[PDB]
Design a protein around this ligand. Sequence first.
Ligand SMILES: [K+]
Ligand SMILES: [K+]
Ligand SMILES: [K+]
Ligand SMILES: [K+]
Ligand SMILES: [K+]
Ligand SMILES: [K+]
Ligand SMILES: [K+]
Ligand SMILES: [K+]
Ligand SMILES: [K+]
Ligand SMILES: [K+]
Ligand SMILES: [K+]
Ligand SMILES: [K+]
Ligand SMILES: [K+]
Ligand SMILES: [K+]
Ligand SMILES: [K+]
Ligand SMILES: [K+]
Ligand SMILES: [K+]
Ligand SMILES: [K+]
Ligand SMILES: [K+]
Ligand SMILES: [K+]
Ligand SMILES: [K+]
Ligand SMILES: [K+]
Ligand SMILES: [K+]
Ligand SMILES: [K+]
Ligand SMILES: [Mg+2]
Ligand SMILES: [Mg+2]
Ligand SMILES: [Mg+2]
Ligand SMILES: [Mg+2]
Ligand SMILES: [Mg+2]
Ligand SMILES: [Mg+2]
Ligand SMILES: [Mg+2]
Ligand SMILES: [Mg+2]
Ligand SMILES: [Mg+2]
Ligand SMILES: [Mg+2]
Ligand SMILES: [Mg+2]
Ligand SMILES: [Mg+2]
Ligand SMILES: [Mg+2]
Ligand SMILES: [Mg+2]
Ligand SMILES: [Mg+2]
Ligand SMILES: [Mg+2]
Ligand SMILES: [Mg+2]
Ligand SMILES: [Mg+2]
Ligand SMILES: [Mg+2]
Ligand SMILES: [Mg+2]
Ligand SMILES: [Mg+2]
Ligand SMILES: [Mg+2]
Ligand SMILES: [Mg+2]
Ligand SMILES: [Mg+2]
Ligand SMILES: [Mg+2]
Ligand SMILES: [Mg+2]
Ligand SMILES: [Mg+2]
Ligand SMILES: [Mg+2]
Ligand SMILES: [Mg+2]
Ligand SMILES: [Mg+2]
Ligand SMILES: [Mg+2]
Ligand SMILES: [Mg+2]
Ligand SMILES: [Mg+2]
Ligand SMILES: [Mg+2]
Ligand SMILES: [Mg+2]
Ligand SMILES: [Mg+2]
Ligand SMILES: [Mg+2]
Ligand SMILES: [Mg+2]
Ligand SMILES: [Mg+2]
Ligand SMILES: [Mg+2]
Ligand SMILES: [Mg+2]
Ligand SMILES: [Mg+2]
Ligand SMILES: [Mg+2]
Ligand SMILES: [Mg+2]
Ligand SMILES: [Mg+2]
Ligand SMILES: [Mg+2]
Ligand SMILES: [Mg+2]
Ligand SMILES: [Mg+2]
Ligand SMILES: [Mg+2]
Ligand SMILES: [Mg+2]
Ligand SMILES: [Mg+2]
Ligand SMILES: [Mg+2]
Ligand SMILES: [Mg+2]
Ligand SMILES: [Mg+2]
Ligand SMILES: [Mg+2]
Ligand SMILES: [Mg+2]
Ligand SMILES: [Mg+2]
Ligand SMILES: [Mg+2]
Ligand SMILES: [Mg+2]
Ligand SMILES: [Mg+2]
Ligand SMILES: [Mg+2]
Ligand SMILES: [Mg+2]
Ligand SMILES: [Mg+2]
Ligand SMILES: [Mg+2]
Ligand SMILES: [Mg+2]
Ligand SMILES: [Mg+2]
Ligand SMILES: [Mg+2]
Lengths: 114, 61, 56, 118, 209, 123
Amino acid sequence: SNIIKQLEQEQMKQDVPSFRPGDTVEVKVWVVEGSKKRLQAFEGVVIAIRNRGLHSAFTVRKISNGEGVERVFQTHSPVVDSISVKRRGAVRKAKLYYLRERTGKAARIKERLN
Amino acid sequence: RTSGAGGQHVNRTESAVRITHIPTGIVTQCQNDRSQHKNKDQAMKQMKAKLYELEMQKKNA
Amino acid sequence: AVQQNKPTRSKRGMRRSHDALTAVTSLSVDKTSGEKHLRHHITADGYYRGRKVIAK
Amino acid sequence: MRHRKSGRQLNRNSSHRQAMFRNMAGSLVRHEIIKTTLPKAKELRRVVEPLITLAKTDSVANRRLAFARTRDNEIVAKLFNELGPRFASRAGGYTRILKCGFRAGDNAPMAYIELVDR
Amino acid sequence: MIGLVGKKVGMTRIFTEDGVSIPVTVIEVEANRVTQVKDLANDGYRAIQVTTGAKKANRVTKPEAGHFAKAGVEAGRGLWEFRLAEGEEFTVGQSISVELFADVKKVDVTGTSKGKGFAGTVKRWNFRTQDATHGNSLSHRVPGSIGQNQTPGKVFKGKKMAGQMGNERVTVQSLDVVRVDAERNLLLVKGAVPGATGSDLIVKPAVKA
Amino acid sequence: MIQEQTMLNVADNSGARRVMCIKVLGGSHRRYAGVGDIIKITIKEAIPRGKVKKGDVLKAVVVRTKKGVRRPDGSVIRFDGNACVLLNNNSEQPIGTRIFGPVTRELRSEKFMKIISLAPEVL
RNA sequence: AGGACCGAACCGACUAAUGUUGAAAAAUUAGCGGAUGACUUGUGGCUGGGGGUGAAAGGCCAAUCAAACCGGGAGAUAGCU
RNA sequence: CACAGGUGGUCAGGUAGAGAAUACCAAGGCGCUUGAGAGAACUCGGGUGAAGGAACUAGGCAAAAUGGUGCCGUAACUUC
RNA sequence: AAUUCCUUGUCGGGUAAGUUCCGACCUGCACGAAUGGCGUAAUGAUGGCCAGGCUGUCUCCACCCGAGACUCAGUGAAAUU
RNA sequence: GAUGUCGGCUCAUCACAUCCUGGGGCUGAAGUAGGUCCCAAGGGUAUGGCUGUUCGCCAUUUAAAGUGGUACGCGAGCUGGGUUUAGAACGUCGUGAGACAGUUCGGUCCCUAUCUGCCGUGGGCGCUGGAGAACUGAGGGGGGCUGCUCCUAGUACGAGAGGACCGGAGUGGACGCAUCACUGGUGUUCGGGUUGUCAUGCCAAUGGCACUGCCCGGUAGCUAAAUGCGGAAGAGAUAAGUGCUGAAAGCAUCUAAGCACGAAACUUGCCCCGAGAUGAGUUCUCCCUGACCCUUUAAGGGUCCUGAAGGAACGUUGAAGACGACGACGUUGAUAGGCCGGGUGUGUAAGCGCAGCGAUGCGUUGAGCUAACCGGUACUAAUGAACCGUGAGGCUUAACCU
Ligand SMILES: [K+]
Ligand SMILES: [K+]
Ligand SMILES: [K+]
Ligand SMILES: [K+]
Ligand SMILES: [K+]
Ligand SMILES: [K+]
Ligand SMILES: [K+]
Ligand SMILES: [K+]
Ligand SMILES: [K+]
Ligand SMILES: [K+]
Ligand SMILES: [K+]
Ligand SMILES: [K+]
Ligand SMILES: [K+]
Ligand SMILES: [K+]
Ligand SMILES: [K+]
Ligand SMILES: [K+]
Ligand SMILES: [K+]
Ligand SMILES: [K+]
Ligand SMILES: [K+]
Ligand SMILES: [K+]
Ligand SMILES: [K+]
Ligand SMILES: [K+]
Ligand SMILES: [K+]
Ligand SMILES: [K+]
Ligand SMILES: [Mg+2]
Ligand SMILES: [Mg+2]
Ligand SMILES: [Mg+2]
Ligand SMILES: [Mg+2]
Ligand SMILES: [Mg+2]
Ligand SMILES: [Mg+2]
Ligand SMILES: [Mg+2]
Ligand SMILES: [Mg+2]
Ligand SMILES: [Mg+2]
Ligand SMILES: [Mg+2]
Ligand SMILES: [Mg+2]
Ligand SMILES: [Mg+2]
Ligand SMILES: [Mg+2]
Ligand SMILES: [Mg+2]
Ligand SMILES: [Mg+2]
Ligand SMILES: [Mg+2]
Ligand SMILES: [Mg+2]
Ligand SMILES: [Mg+2]
Ligand SMILES: [Mg+2]
Ligand SMILES: [Mg+2]
Ligand SMILES: [Mg+2]
Ligand SMILES: [Mg+2]
Ligand SMILES: [Mg+2]
Ligand SMILES: [Mg+2]
Ligand SMILES: [Mg+2]
Ligand SMILES: [Mg+2]
Ligand SMILES: [Mg+2]
Ligand SMILES: [Mg+2]
Ligand SMILES: [Mg+2]
Ligand SMILES: [Mg+2]
Ligand SMILES: [Mg+2]
Ligand SMILES: [Mg+2]
Ligand SMILES: [Mg+2]
Ligand SMILES: [Mg+2]
Ligand SMILES: [Mg+2]
Ligand SMILES: [Mg+2]
Ligand SMILES: [Mg+2]
Ligand SMILES: [Mg+2]
Ligand SMILES: [Mg+2]
Ligand SMILES: [Mg+2]
Ligand SMILES: [Mg+2]
Ligand SMILES: [Mg+2]
Ligand SMILES: [Mg+2]
Ligand SMILES: [Mg+2]
Ligand SMILES: [Mg+2]
Ligand SMILES: [Mg+2]
Ligand SMILES: [Mg+2]
Ligand SMILES: [Mg+2]
Ligand SMILES: [Mg+2]
Ligand SMILES: [Mg+2]
Ligand SMILES: [Mg+2]
Ligand SMILES: [Mg+2]
Ligand SMILES: [Mg+2]
Ligand SMILES: [Mg+2]
Ligand SMILES: [Mg+2]
Ligand SMILES: [Mg+2]
Ligand SMILES: [Mg+2]
Ligand SMILES: [Mg+2]
Ligand SMILES: [Mg+2]
Ligand SMILES: [Mg+2]
Ligand SMILES: [Mg+2]
Ligand SMILES: [Mg+2]
Ligand SMILES: [Mg+2]
Ligand SMILES: [Mg+2]
Ligand SMILES: [Mg+2]
Ligand SMILES: [Mg+2]
Ligand SMILES: [Mg+2]
């Protein structure tokens, strides 16, 4: 209700950039090893977005060192330091789950040139 | 219970006997007879024979 | 499964002790026609709460 | 369990329910008062009233949507030509339900459902 | 210490600055008014009766209305009792706010769990279903055997069978008190508490500790 | 989420290509092994001149799963295959000298420092 | 060409489930085998009981078969209940 | 039995289809002689299912899977 | 061995592990040459074993869609005692 | 004139002759690790290969993979591989029909629960005027498992190798309870793609049917694989055991008098049910303060008048629910629908314009549609009434006012 909505509004971030499924994004997240705290970049295609207010999330898929890796980021998590869109993709679905069966040329996504 | 037991009696009764020699690990087993006592006697005879044969194999070696 | 012994008329009546019907507590009287009807239902003349709802 | 669910199954499958409510909506629009069972009338509210809300605004897209919901041009025309203007000012609740006893054949609870301005 | 009566508002998450998401239950704990105080001389035990919320004037019956008027408090939506330790002392008409939990680390939350209705043995008691194939006849989720043969010739009391599940009083113990918001009458506890949204909860200081 | 009979790929250069989980170690009736868990494996396929032979029984540590791992903030990292790193039965130290593909932070322990150091990428 | 191949009608009946006071005194549903042949089917005929017929299972001979059914000997006999 | 059985012959539209298969229709005929609700367990008949993938079991039973046309290509063995 | 009691014979193969399977051996309880011996391509709703694929068979069940079960109106059995 | 049987499955329940965890004695017990006996039954006590198997062997685990009873528990719960009919064959016996605690391939597992029992859910009356709540707790049930790492400490011990007791912290396995914030499943009630065909006169746009025709997504709800929590600490009395003081028996002696320790067992402590606890308890509050007549004259029956508190019924309903029941609401109202706004999902509707020969693309456009969600809103339906429930509540004896 109003109470939970207020509790979530006071936690939501304010500078989340607009991105759509099919966009290539770079997400810089905080990695804490021992006592040193740095940023690690995860770059890949957004294949799913779950718009749920404070509970919003998005899935990014990349091919790292010959393996396919999907990471689901909570958008308003403090661990997600930054999100940037490196390339705008042109798809027609809200969930690009069919990319999991495609590799190389078959997995290419056309650029949304406007 | 013996294998291929036919009938209520045989299905229920524990007639097959297996004897294991703890020091050696050699095992004998008898289930030919209906009587557990006869099976145990035959298995004891086979166990005695096998221990003697083990000693005989050592002597032959 | 079936009974081993025939149940009695006593046990039959005991079981049927809860089978009694309940009469309608009271009937409502329409403010205009004066007809008795089930509460929250229209009357046999097509009236409800003093208003002729269904003609004929 | 059916926590927070909505919609009466009415001992039918989905396609039969949809067809029956399409026909019943057509009949209610045509005659402006019909006699059905109480559960069917209470479910018919949620089908018919959105049709009138759709008819409130007259456009080609809305007419095609109303045809898709109720495949009869007579019902579509009556909606958009009379019931929209009739119920323009009314917020909702274009229908009322009057319980009317029990059906003789099977003791089913019966109700009239009618348009409120009839 | 005594507890308070609240309402289950829902579930949220709290993001800590070190990147940890804490699942929280939000309990709206408005002021609880003391409607009666019980003592050894008159009742034989020491406890306070409290009420909370508001109620319809035309739905408060005259006995309830008189009971509230003797205390001098507005009619709440119910009455609950809390036993008193020998140090605690309250007075009739006194109001207690969620500030009582300001220095409490863990709480026990009691509520009426969600009702599942008539539940089978598989759901209710985690019985294992029998084989779905391999010749099984009409016995896929049935209990199985329910006793031994002629001895004892009966089914033992407390046998696990199908029946009503849920809709009963359930207490979850030792939940962390994430936040006490006095101005919004909010108690954010870590984890899940029994009951659906809008149900009454009883929050006490943790008895285990 | 690895159990018995699960086939896994090998993320090192020990010579094995496919292994099968035959036991999830570390408890009675234990069902699954996630990332950072030790399992007992048999080797189903190996390269001709590897350090291990087909049919060998040894240990392994699961480094990638399709079920994935969950981070404290609710995030989840998933991979496209189940992959493990082979280990001696006794020392439980890695057999190979190279680690292939990324691993996760869940191996950041004194037990698997060799794997962490040799991994191309840690997530 | 083919006791050839695939596959409907057609003839069958290998598996499972359901049914078992059944919708049915042998079936339904999903599959299954043959489907120009030693095939299948309509109408009519012939073989009769220690007899028929049987690519043979003691199978079939009107829901009856190591000897059909009906009537008779007959109130067989029953140291048995 | 107003019984999900059995019962020989004749007729043979459209679209797709090799087809008398199959899907949807025509001519024509029917909604199957108890209904109304509800939306528990459990039974039946289906749909989908994370990770695993025969570990199930007497047994891969059941289910899942394969499935067309054209072309490329096709092993041991063989009575060719 | 559709034949072997002892017997889960022994050795080899396959499996992490194989009373089953496959190859041998010969100590054939109790094979053997038209109540045929040993082979054998093709065939088989034939028996056993193995693999890939596939999967709710299973870890371990969850949800959903229908027909019953439940309530109301009408009609209205049965075994058993 | 019928008590169905091996193994498996599902579900168990008890014994202790204890497998693990707990406590102890002795040790040919340095430590670690054992051996053996005593106490202890609270909890726990594998998955696979082979076989119909029980058993057993084997592989790999575990703190451990206990031994038993229960019609060798459990087929009106399931299975039907073994066994156990009718077919067939091998070996063997017989001249043969046939036979084999020889083998081999195939081969119908019915029952709508009357009673007891058990799991849940109601109705009636009672509890002594009626009613609405909150309790108390007699009693009953649940739960009770354990690994590994680190500190103590490389300390005690030991020649070394190795390596503690006691105490403390962390993190797991299995199990259980709750919940859906997350991660997921489902989502035939939301959006879209698409195949065949039919129809809406046709085009365009839709609808029907083909398992939701096939698919791709997905709200709410439910849910696990998801994530919170739990087992305890403490107390009392003890078991085996250890003692102090202490005679009988000038010594000795844990015992005879007296006194102290002592375990996952017992009683509590934790959670739940619980006054039909007929021994029906307690507390708070609310309501009812008329007349008359008879009899067999009393805890009697009428007559009129009166009808309270409250309840029930009816209706709108609910994360409540088989039906009951329980909860919310009934105009002095947000109970349900609708409506409005938002959100969510789908993914840029239609129509029109432009480009293209055309399929199609682009613009209008993140457009259109959007279930169960959230916040509002009396537009619709929750009707005035009526119904049940009474009129001051027995006797005896005390205490107090009187
Ligand atoms: K009728
Ligand atoms: K004859
Ligand atoms: K058709
Ligand atoms: K032989
Ligand atoms: K011959
Ligand atoms: K020959
Ligand atoms: K074969
Ligand atoms: K012990
Ligand atoms: K000892
Ligand atoms: K015990
Ligand atoms: K055996
Ligand atoms: K037992
Ligand atoms: K028995
Ligand atoms: K019985
Ligand atoms: K009885
Ligand atoms: K969820
Ligand atoms: K969901
Ligand atoms: K169409
Ligand atoms: K002494
Ligand atoms: K009482
Ligand atoms: K509303
Ligand atoms: K467009
Ligand atoms: K458009
Ligand atoms: K939109
Ligand atoms: Mg015999
Ligand atoms: Mg009755
Ligand atoms: Mg609702
Ligand atoms: Mg019906
Ligand atoms: Mg359909
Ligand atoms: Mg419920
Ligand atoms: Mg059957
Ligand atoms: Mg079944
Ligand atoms: Mg008895
Ligand atoms: Mg042919
Ligand atoms: Mg054919
Ligand atoms: Mg025919
Ligand atoms: Mg035949
Ligand atoms: Mg058929
Ligand atoms: Mg053929
Ligand atoms: Mg014969
Ligand atoms: Mg016959
Ligand atoms: Mg004769
Ligand atoms: Mg005579
Ligand atoms: Mg006679
Ligand atoms: Mg009929
Ligand atoms: Mg017929
Ligand atoms: Mg259903
Ligand atoms: Mg089902
Ligand atoms: Mg399926
Ligand atoms: Mg799956
Ligand atoms: Mg999958
Ligand atoms: Mg696979
Ligand atoms: Mg197996
Ligand atoms: Mg098994
Ligand atoms: Mg099959
Ligand atoms: Mg299939
Ligand atoms: Mg071998
Ligand atoms: Mg195998
Ligand atoms: Mg061989
Ligand atoms: Mg021969
Ligand atoms: Mg001869
Ligand atoms: Mg021959
Ligand atoms: Mg043939
Ligand atoms: Mg009836
Ligand atoms: Mg008898
Ligand atoms: Mg003992
Ligand atoms: Mg006990
Ligand atoms: Mg205890
Ligand atoms: Mg075993
Ligand atoms: Mg086997
Ligand atoms: Mg016995
Ligand atoms: Mg037993
Ligand atoms: Mg038994
Ligand atoms: Mg029984
Ligand atoms: Mg059999
Ligand atoms: Mg025979
Ligand atoms: Mg057969
Ligand atoms: Mg049965
Ligand atoms: Mg109930
Ligand atoms: Mg207990
Ligand atoms: Mg939610
Ligand atoms: Mg999803
Ligand atoms: Mg779906
Ligand atoms: Mg659709
Ligand atoms: Mg067209
Ligand atoms: Mg049609
Ligand atoms: Mg049709
Ligand atoms: Mg002395
Ligand atoms: Mg413990
Ligand atoms: Mg959106
Ligand atoms: Mg469209």
